[PDB]
Amino acid sequence: MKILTERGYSFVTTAEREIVRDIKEKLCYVALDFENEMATAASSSSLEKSYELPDGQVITIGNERFRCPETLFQPSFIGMESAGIHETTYNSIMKCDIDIRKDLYANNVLSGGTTMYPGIADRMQKEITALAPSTMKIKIIAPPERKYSVWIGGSILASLSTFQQMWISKQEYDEAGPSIVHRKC
Amino acid sequence: QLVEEELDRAQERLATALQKLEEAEKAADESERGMKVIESRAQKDEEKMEIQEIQLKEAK
Numbered sequence: 335m336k337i338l339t340e341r342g343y344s345f346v347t348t349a350e351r352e353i354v355r356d357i358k359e360k361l362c363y364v365a366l367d368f369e370n371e372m373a374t375a376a377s378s379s380s381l382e383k384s385y386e387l388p389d390g391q392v393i394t395i396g397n398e399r400f401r402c403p404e405t406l407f408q409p410s411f412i413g414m415e416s417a418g419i420h421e422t423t424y425n426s427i428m429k430c431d432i433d434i435r436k437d438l439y440a441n442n443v444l445s446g447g448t449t450m451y452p453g454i455a456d457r458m459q460k461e462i463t464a465l466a467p468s469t470m471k472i473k474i475i476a477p478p479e480r481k482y483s484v485w486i487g488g489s490i491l492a493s494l495s496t497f498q499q500m501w502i503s504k505q506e507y508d509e510a511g512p513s514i515v516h517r518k519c
Numbered sequence: 520q521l522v523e524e525e526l527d528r529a530q531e532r533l534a535t536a537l538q539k540l541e542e543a544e545k546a547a548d549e550s551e552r553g554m555k556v557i558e559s560r561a562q563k564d565e566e567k568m569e570i571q572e573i574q575l576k577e578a579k
């Protein structure tokens with residue numbers, strides 16, 4: 335919403351925020367190499383696509399398409415101090431015991447909606463490969479339905495027979511108070 | 520006789536005009552049908568083209 339104002343389009347309402355969310359879900363992708371992608375978009379106009387708001391009024395966006403999700407890898411674009419998702423993944427790995435991180439390097443599982451951009455698995459693998467030692471096999475696992483992985487796994491879990499003793503019954507709550515939840519389960 | 524001759528001649532010509540209008544609106548209907556099917560086809564083709572071009576992008 336903030337980066338689209340430099341082309342003239344101004345979305346300020348909450349409804350317009352929903353419109354911009356739809357634009358993001360339809361036109362944005364992750365660039366494998368950000369710098370030369372930027373130079374390419376500057377040179378030609380083959381990256382420009384068009385979107386039609388729900389009153390006519392087509393809008394055309396250029397390098398915004400990949401500048402929007404690039405923030406995941408350079409969170410300094412929005413004034414945050416953290417590191418990109420590739421770097422926090424690598425740090426979380428390197429915070430684990432040296433014997434399991436070879437098997438962690440090869441089972442990076444992606445989940446949730448924000449991991450649905452075209453080309454995010456390739457960029458992620460490139461970055462982690464550049465960070466990790468040159469002997470490990472980096473494998474990014476990105477299922478085609480990863481937007482509902484949490485719900486699917488939750489149904490699998492709640493269906494297990496060995497899980498039917500892990501519920502928090504009403505009686506346990508009546509005994510222990512709301513603090514039952516984290517104190518035991 | 521001028522009154523009644525203008526009357527019935529203009530009336531039958533008005534009938535011909537309304538039939539021409541019905542023909543014109545049916546032409547509008549068929550043209551609109553062609554337009555809608557063709558634009559839907561264009562939409563499908565364009566979205567598939569975009570999928571395939573980005574697939575070549577990732578592949579290469």
Ligand SMILES: Nc1ncnc2c1ncn2[C@@H]1O[C@H](COP(=O)(O)OP(=O)(O)O)[C@@H](O)[C@H]1O
Pocket residue numbers: 355358359360446447448450451481
């Ligand atoms: N195809 C897509 N491409 C890019 N982003 C998407 C896509 N689909 C959803 N999103 C983003 O994912 C978010 C919703 O994802 P979701 O996993 O449902 O989050 P939550 O689990 O918190 O509800 C939205 O903010 C939207 O911007």
